[PDB]
């Protein structure tokens, strides 16, 4: 099947440059163009440019002087580079392929890459448990979680038990603290009868700081 897979998120300083790699499978770059689209809360979805089968490029008008797209056909990789970055370039960047070699009907999308443009420095999170309580177990169900505190930039990814626990999980949108650092919580509701035997571990990954923190969440004695 057709797949597009992107490099990870990261922080760039104002005035610097970003580089994103899109690795494709299921089709050849010699037969399809690959397009780039970004999405932000403030500007919505915005088409950025394309590299066509034969290597020609088109860049959307706002970006002609600071965008470069090239590729490695033999390795099925497309490289997106953008220069002179400012705050309003913070966005999720996607690569995409159309149904037909020449068209813009985007049937296949990468997973997206969050690029943050800010003068701040990267900081990985501290992770604290939100232990299940005894006076707080409502009708056979208990709530527990993890507090993911004081990191920059977004995003963090949280899983529970390495992906084996997905039902009842709520990972909340991050809040920006007045310190300029993000915090979020992730919770899960589980059977009260399970709390003595079942282990619950929250897995927190922050690619920009290359940190992965696993925290076991236990009833207290």
């Amino acid at each position: 099947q057709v797949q597009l897979k992107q490099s990870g998120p990261g922080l760039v300083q104002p005035g610097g440059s970003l580089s994103i790699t899109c690795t494709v499978s299921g089709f050849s770059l010699t037969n399809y163009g690959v397009h780039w689209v970004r999405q932000s809360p403030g500007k919505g979805l915005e088409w950025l440019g394309v590299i066509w089968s034969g290597g020609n490029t088109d860049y959307n008008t706002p970006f002609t002087s600071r965008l470069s797209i090239n590729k490695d056909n033999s390795k099925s990789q497309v490289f997106f580079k953008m220069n002179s970055l400012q705050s309003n370039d913070t966005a999720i960047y996607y690569c995409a392929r159309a149904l037909t070699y020449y068209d813009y009907e985007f049937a296949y999308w990468g997973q997206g890459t969050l690029v943050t443009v800010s003068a701040a420095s990267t900081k990985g999170p501290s992770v604290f448990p939100l232990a299940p309580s005894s006076k707080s177990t409502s009708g056979g169900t208990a709530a527990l979680g993890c507090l993911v505190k004081d990191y920059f930039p977004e995003p963090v990814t949280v899983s529970w038990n390495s992906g084996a626990l997905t039902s009842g999980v709520h990972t909340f949108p991050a809040v920006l603290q007045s310190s300029g650092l993000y915090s979020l919580s992730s919770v899960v509701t589980v059977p009260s009868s399970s709390l003595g035997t079942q282990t619950y571990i929250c897995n927190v990954n922050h690619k920009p700081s290359n940190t992965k923190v696993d925290k076991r969440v236990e009833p207290k004695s």
């Binding site: 919505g44 088409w47 990468g110 309580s133 507090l147 919770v187």
Partner: protein, 213 residues
């Protein structure tokens, strides 16, 4: 460049109903419009191309219509998996451009939140700060209010909250609120309380704990 205008911003619909999304172009685009679904934290998914043409793997309940400047995406019999944002795209005129999205909300019966309070962890307290967390789980509708009280005094200026997007399995929301204190301030007070109001609650619900007990 062509502006694509989607209105309204949010469409709230009951399960099983037919829902229609509007997209209008600032100049005629013929039938050169495509539609996408984007679920929370997901990538766009192509639903319809060229105003009305079907896409492999998309349920038959999705269809599109229109020509010129006035276009519609329709879902017959909407269901929970349709909870998402919906975008239009024109490509009659370079550069291709996108609408700003319409959010689909599915109505359901009123559900009061289940409320949980979490003291700061001993590990956090080591480092000089105390975060108290209040969870409001699986409620509808989205409006909810949290009040923090410390020794029965209403707190202001030291909390932040976050709300999830609508859950595609049960059509509810959840909310987390964090009260942040210094360890020194935390250890000066006894009763920590989260007080919750919601349409499904005829009286406020309070969850509290006594520090150290």
């Amino acid at each position: 460049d062509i502006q694509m205008t989607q209105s309204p911003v949010i469409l709230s619909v009951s399960p099983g109903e037919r829902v229609s999304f509007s997209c209008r172009a600032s100049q005629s685009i013929g039938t050169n419009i495509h539609w996408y679904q984007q679920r929370t934290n997901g990538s766009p998914r192509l639903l319809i191309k060229y105003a009305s043409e079907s896409i492999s793997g998309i349920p038959s309940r999705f269809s599109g219509s229109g020509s010129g400047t006035d276009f519609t995406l329709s879902i017959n019999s909407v269901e929970s998996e349709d909870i998402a944002d919906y975008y239009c795209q024109q490509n009659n005129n370079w550069p291709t451009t996108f609408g700003a999205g319409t959010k689909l909300e599915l109505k359901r019966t009123v559900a009061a939140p289940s409320v949980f309070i979490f003291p700061p962890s001993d590990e956090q307290l080591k480092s000089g700060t105390a975060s108290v967390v209040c969870l409001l789980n699986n409620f509808y509708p989205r409006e909810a209010k949290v009040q923090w009280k410390v020794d029965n005094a209403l707190q202001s200026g030291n909390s932040q909250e976050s709300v999830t997007e609508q859950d595609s399995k049960d059509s509810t929301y959840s909310l987390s609120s964090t009260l942040t204190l210094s360890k020194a301030d935390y250890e000066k007070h006894k009763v920590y309380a989260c007080e919750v109001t919601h349409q499904g609650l005829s009286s406020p619900v309070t969850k509290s704990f006594n520090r150290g007990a």
